[PDB]
């Protein structure tokens, strides 16, 4: 029953059925009175899920080639920060098997075969596991809530079978999800200010914290 940063306008719709329902809504964004296209109580918890899971793949992924290079498990050519890895070819470009403009077309082809399927399950649940898709359309049916399908592919260890266990574990997903969005936003501002990768930013601060903070470094 922990409640922080809440208002009586915010608790009119945040009744606690959400996983990360801590009452934090000062602006009043999940109000069902003016629910529209993207500012509505059906898309916004599901938007935090997809932004949470891409940031948990993002915050872990932008530091993993830098941590693994200091301990000596990957080559130093790939042991590079995230910004000088072909993402922003101004601050640095690394030569992959393809140039990143061709890799972007390969990205949105595979994202277009993955996020269009994720899109139409939100508008109508279970309507995608009917048409033939490579003999694997039966597993891609999903639940009523489109943030958690829980099929044979997205729950392939079956972890969280109990309803009380799965609901409490959904709280740990969004709280690790929300920390990862502030990490990637923290990764973004440190890449512009410090100009060096985030694992070097942790190692610089762990040696001299009073001389390598945000105030000293730009």
């Amino acid at each position: 029953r922990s409640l922080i940063f809440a208002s009586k306008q915010s608790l009119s719709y945040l009744d606690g059925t959400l996983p990360g329902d801590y009452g934090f809504d000062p602006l009043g964004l999940m109000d069902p009175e003016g629910a529209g296209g993207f500012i509505d109580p059906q898309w916004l918890p599901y938007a935090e899920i997809i932004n949470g899971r891409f940031a948990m793949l993002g915050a872990a992924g932008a530091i993993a080639p830098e941590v693994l290079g200091r301990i000596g498990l990957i080559p130093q050519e790939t042991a590079i920060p995230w910004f000088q890895s072909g993402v922003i070819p101004p601050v640095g470009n690394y030569s992959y098997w393809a140039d990143p403009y061709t890799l972007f077309v390969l990205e949105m082809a595979l994202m277009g075969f993955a996020e269009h399927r994720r899109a139409q399950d939100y508008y109508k649940p279970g309507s995608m596991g009917k048409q033939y898709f490579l003999g694997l359309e039966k597993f891609l049916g999903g639940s009523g809530n489109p943030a958690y399908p829980g099929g044979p592919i997205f729950n392939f260890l079956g972890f969280g079978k109990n309803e009380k266990e799965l609901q409490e574990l959904k709280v740990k997903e969004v709280k690790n999800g929300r920390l990862a969005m502030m990490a990637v936003l923290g990764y973004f501002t440190q890449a512009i200010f410090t100009g060096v990768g985030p694992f070097q930013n942790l190692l610089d601060h762990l040696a001299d914290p009073v001389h390598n903070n945000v105030l000293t470094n730009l």
């Binding site: 009043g28 109000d31 003016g34 500012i39 101004p90 105030l215």
Partner: protein, 742 residues
Amino acid sequence: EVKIMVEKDPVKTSFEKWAKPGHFSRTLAKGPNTTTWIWNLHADAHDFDSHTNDLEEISRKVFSAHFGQLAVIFIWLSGMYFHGARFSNYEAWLSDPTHIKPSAQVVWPIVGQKILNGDVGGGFQGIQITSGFFQLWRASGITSELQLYTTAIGGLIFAALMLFAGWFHYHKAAPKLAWFQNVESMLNHHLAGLLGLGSLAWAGHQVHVSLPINRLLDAGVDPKEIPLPHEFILNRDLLAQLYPSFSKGLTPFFTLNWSEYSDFLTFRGGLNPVTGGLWLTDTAHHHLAIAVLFLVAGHMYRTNFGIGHSMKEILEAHKGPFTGEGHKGLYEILTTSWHAQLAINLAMLGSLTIIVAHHMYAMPPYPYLATDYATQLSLFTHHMWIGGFLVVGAAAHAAIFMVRDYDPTTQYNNLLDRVLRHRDAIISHLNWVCIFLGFHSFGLYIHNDTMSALGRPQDMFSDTAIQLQPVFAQWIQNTHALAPSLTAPNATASTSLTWGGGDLVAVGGKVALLPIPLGTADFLVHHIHAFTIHVTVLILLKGVLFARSSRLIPDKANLGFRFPCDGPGRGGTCQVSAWDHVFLGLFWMYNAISVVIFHFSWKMQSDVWGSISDQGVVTHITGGNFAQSSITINGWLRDFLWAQASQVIQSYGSSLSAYGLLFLGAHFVWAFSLMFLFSGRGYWQELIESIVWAHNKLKVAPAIQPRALSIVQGRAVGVAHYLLGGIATTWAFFLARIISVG
């Protein structure tokens, strides 16, 4: 209480309402029966208050119409950047702009119009543009045409976004009425989010992109070897070699050592002697200051976070003994009527555009703006015409608020009720000051014409005859020139060169600016300007005040806005309507703004624009004749309307011959206006009856009955051709003369 109220799918996106043209009005939904249905189809097309009585759907219509307007402006900006990218000599002009004219329009060689592709310089043929886009892109730091093409396709992307948002906020998620009635949040996000963050973002551009590129352009560096704008952001040593204050790296900002930013954030003032345009260290300090000031002003009103102002509480506490219950209900005026807010916003935008015109000839913000005289004359003239049109439209929508949204029950004993209660005093004292100004300016001109005609040059109002020196203006210009020494210390130079601080800036052998003299001629023409502005205020304010009723017609509000008359009774009630006062104020805007731009063109062609030879001698275009010829109407007809029209009429057989063609066709549209203005409907209706008889004789009668245009429509067509023809006449004469002598 401020939060998002929208609702989902109000109207289905269908083409079945496209097929029926008059769907918005109940009278036009029955289909056509006369040819006046077509004109009321266009007249009531945008009039959303006449369609429905529900302000919610009206506000949704206005919001999506704003998005469609934004899409049209982004399509226009996409076109002007694509014309810079493909059909211009912007790189050739950017190599050296003192000899190559700005041109961004290529015509097709089809019917002899390929002579209009003139020798503008740089190995390029095209129409010499006067819109100032080249100097604007030089001030933006644009070096290549690939950046212009990228800005064009980005503007096309934003135009598609505005079209998508206009469809979205009418057919998918349209806001409700209380969303638009959150005016405190709208002002908080327009002051801070739009004008504050916009000024802050353009300040960041003018710190990183405009400033180092324009510093390298002052050093004579070729733009093909100037480093690209992101290289200053990436290689900050390259940015630090032009400004050493960048070597500290954002630590003086958060430690309040802002004076260490004195290398690139200055309060210099004046013009760059290399280019003739304002400094971008001053334009970047200007934008950073108006951003740290609009973002402060955007945290003023009360939305839903407790702190702030309810502006109804601001208004209802503003009440005085000369008014009593004033300012009360004006919040209910300005949140339940779109026309009242449109009147205030149009008055501020038109007056602001006039501010823009004066603050651009006088303080030219763009490099090589002042020395390209065609750009200066066209920018001043364009912004004066836009500003005059918007202030006449301000009075128009003020009058529409009176005839269709003014509720007298909610407005008792406030400011508006008392202004209506003494409107005879306002209009009569305005009438007196207009007649007094008309004699004491134009009869002074007639007196000068008479004594110059009668061989009495000493009996005139000259600088050599009876002097009428503007001692207040001549003192405020000395106060603005002798300011840096004592009243404004921290300034390196003065605000403008036209004040009297010397600094004869010569850019390319042509005068950017110098001290502007003010004499008897300037006094006379400024009293003409005050007179014409006052008379335009007189017709327009009379239409606002007598929109409800009059001593003549006490039930004028029931007749509406676009009604012609009551009839031939009470002696004749022709043009009693508030619309007809907007119609006459359009003519008085023509008169006012046309004399303003005529005074501008002659005043700076005689006292500012020219050339500087060796040993500091300044030869103007029409040397020194404003002080002696602009005090008589014969000088205005002779040394301005005849001497300077000696390049619009003999431009035939050259690249400026389209200005001669549109000069003559503009005379045609003006004399065509006099057909609609002087005539009336019933004559044309019976002439059309004779033509309909000739059609009945040969069985070519249309079922849509041919009708004469309505009296409101005939006046609208006449004033549209009058403004179009006269404004196009001045456009053609200006853009032929100052291109020819520039």
